[PDB]
């Protein structure tokens, strides 16, 4: 706090130096005056754009690695500034966003609301329900401000109207828009502001002479007092109520359910007349993962129905929806199996139950249903001719083995380029690469052996 453009461009200069010490980075764009948190002289942000993807092909050249290296460099060498490099989210925003907005639903002092903000923050750090780290009050800074106390007794005695005092302070500190002037064929602005030598000394504030009613120029020193207190540099009003942004996260180890649950009770603890609410980023749309039992609810219902529609019975659909977990164990072991592989050498295994795993799994569940549909439909024809369950199942499996292999292994091989895919959006291409590849391989394998069994189990019971 209390930073200025000189010190800010000094820190930015160091940032540009450190960024140009990294060969991965092609160009860097430093901008003073703005950051994600807010604006001012203290706020600044830089965009370190990289070289082409083709050149940055080594362990430690990924965007996260340079981010970590640059942040480490700054945290070690950057003087007079907190500087951190972060990686941009893939889609939704276009960092992990966690926006609580603690509002006061009673007209209590801003000091008490921010003291209760820190109270919420502190008690959430101390508690394990709101898993530690990722704790930072979002917004801006607190800064030492000047406070001009003007007793109206002085204004009544020999002083001037408050309006003239406003004109004085405003035009001497923050400029004054007076009129428009014709410049090179365009109406531009004319602005009047006091010199640098004046509007920059804290004691100089009183030295400005306001015009008294009788045409007298009187300094503020005679009528005012300057108080070096503190104040906010950003006032946040969320939903009509003055609020504050604070952070805390349950990620990659704990569900957000318990934390988002206890926090309402947390806000209840202080005041009782205080409330909170949620905003956020891509991590809020990441939450859309507990809508899954309706997905597979509609999925197995649509497949069971269409099966009962074509095949004209209810045994065969049950002989197929029995095959859906066989592809699930393949996809899950593929993700887990690659999380095993990548973790042993030099990379951080970063595969999970993301949307690419989900869409890729939906495909696999379809192809496995196709396979099961194929052999059990032929064995359905064969049971009609008095051929026994084990017989009909075997002759079916015998007749559909080659095409099943021919289709599946054409597809399994087909997703290998996705499996080994690197470069841009490679995390996604490999995510759907792994879950589909192993999900279809183990899927096909377990299916091709257990599906003829599925007919025998089902039909001998139905």
């Amino acid at each position: 706090a209390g930073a200025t453009k000189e010190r800010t461009d000094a820190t930015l200069a160091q940032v540009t130096q450190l960024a140009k010490s990294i060969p991965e980075i092609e160009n860097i764009i430093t901008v003073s005056g703005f950051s994600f948190s807010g604006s001012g002289q203290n706020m600044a942000m830089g965009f370190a754009i990289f070289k082409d993807w083709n050149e940055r092909t080594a362990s430690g050249s990924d965007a996260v690695a340079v981010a970590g290296k640059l942040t480490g460099m700054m945290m070690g060498t950057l003087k007079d500034g907190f500087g951190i490099a972060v990686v941009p989210p893939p889609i939704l925003e276009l960092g992990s966003g966690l926006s609580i907005n603690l509002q006061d639903r009673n007209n209590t002092g801003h000091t008490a609301l921010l003291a209760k903000r820190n109270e919420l923050i502190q008690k959430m750090r101390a508690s394990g329900l709101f898993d530690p780290s990722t704790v930072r009050a979002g917004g801006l800074e607190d800064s030492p401000q000047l406070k001009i106390d003007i007793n109206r007794a002085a204004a009544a005695a020999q002083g001037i109207s408050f309006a003239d005092i406003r004109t004085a302070l405003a035009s001497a500190l923050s400029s004054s828009y007076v009129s428009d002037f014709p410049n090179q064929g365009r109406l531009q602005r004319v602005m009047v502001q006091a010199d640098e030598d004046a509007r920059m000394q804290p004691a100089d504030i009183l030295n400005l002479t306001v015009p008294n009613k009788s045409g007298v120029a009187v300094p503020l020193s005679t009528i005012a007092t300057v108080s070096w207190e503190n104040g906010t540099e950003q006032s946040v009003r969320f939903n009509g109520y003055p609020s504050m942004k604070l952070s805390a996260s349950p990620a990659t180890g704990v569900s957000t359910g318990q934390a988002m649950e206890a926090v309402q009770k947390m806000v209840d603890e202080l005041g009782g007349g205080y409330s909170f609410e949620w905003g956020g980023q891509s991590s809020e749309e990441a939450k859309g993962g507990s809508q899954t039992l309706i997905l597979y609810g509609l999925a197995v219902a649509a497949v069971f129905l269409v099966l009962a529609a074509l095949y004209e019975s209810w045994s065969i659909p049950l002989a197929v929806i029995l095959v859906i977990p066989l592809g699930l164990i393949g996809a899950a072991a593929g993700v887990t199996g690659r999380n095993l592989f990548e973790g042993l050498l030099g990379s951080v295994p970063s595969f999970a139950n993301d949307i690419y795993f989900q869409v890729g799994f939906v495909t696999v569940m379809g192809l496995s249903a196709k396979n099961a549909i194929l052999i059990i439909e032929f064995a359905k024809d064969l049971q009609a001719q008095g051929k026994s369950a084990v017989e009909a199942a075997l002759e079916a499996a015998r007749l559909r083995f080659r095409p099943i292999i021919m289709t599946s292994f054409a597809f399994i091989l087909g997703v290998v380029p996705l499996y080994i895919a690197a470069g841009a959006s490679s995390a996604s291409q490999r995510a759907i690469g792994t879950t589909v590849f192993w999900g279809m391989l183990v899927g096909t394998l377990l299916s091709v052996f257990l599906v003829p069994l599925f007919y025998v189990v089902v039909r001998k019971f139905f």
Binding site: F47, R189, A194, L208, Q234, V236
Partner: protein, 144 residues
């Protein structure tokens, strides 16, 4: 509001608009950001069903009803309404030797509004800096 600190900015300008901004259709939630840079903002995020055409102008509706009670300095400045995705598509770095940053910012405003706002897709172009003005720097001592 050039001189307004965080509280003056929030109260005299930003809070006046907000009190009229949830009569707007499909108003999911609203926030306000008032800082010490003499700038103030109030965001109105709407329900997922996208209709920026009806919403942006119902916002302008309420703000047209509001502009009068706003401070004379702010009203002279003008309060803008924009349906803005905060994401940056691309930056266009203008670099020159004969010209300076101030001078380029004057011609930047000459190729950016007539041409770079007309282009389909783009709904906002933010220039880094400011167009040039007739700055008058008085000395208060020569004033007294």
């Amino acid at each position: 509001y050039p001189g307004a600190s965080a509280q003056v900015m929030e109260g005299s300008v930003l809070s006046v608009i907000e009190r009229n901004m949830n009569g707007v259709e499909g108003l999911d939630y609203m926030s306000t950001s008032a800082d010490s840079s003499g700038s103030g903002s109030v965001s109105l995020t709407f329900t997922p069903d996208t209709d920026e055409n009806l919403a942006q102008v119902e916002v302008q509706n309420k703000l047209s009803e509001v502009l009068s009670t706003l401070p004379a300095t702010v009203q002279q400045y003008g309060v803008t309404v924009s349906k803005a995705r905060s994401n940056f598509l691309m930056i266009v770095m203008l670099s020159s030797d004969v010209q300076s940053t101030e001078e380029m910012n004057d011609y930047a405003q000459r190729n950016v509004v007539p041409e770079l706002q007309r282009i389909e897709g783009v709904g906002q172009v933010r220039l880094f800096g400011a167009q040039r003005a007739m700055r008058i720097w008085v000395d208060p001592k020569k004033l007294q």
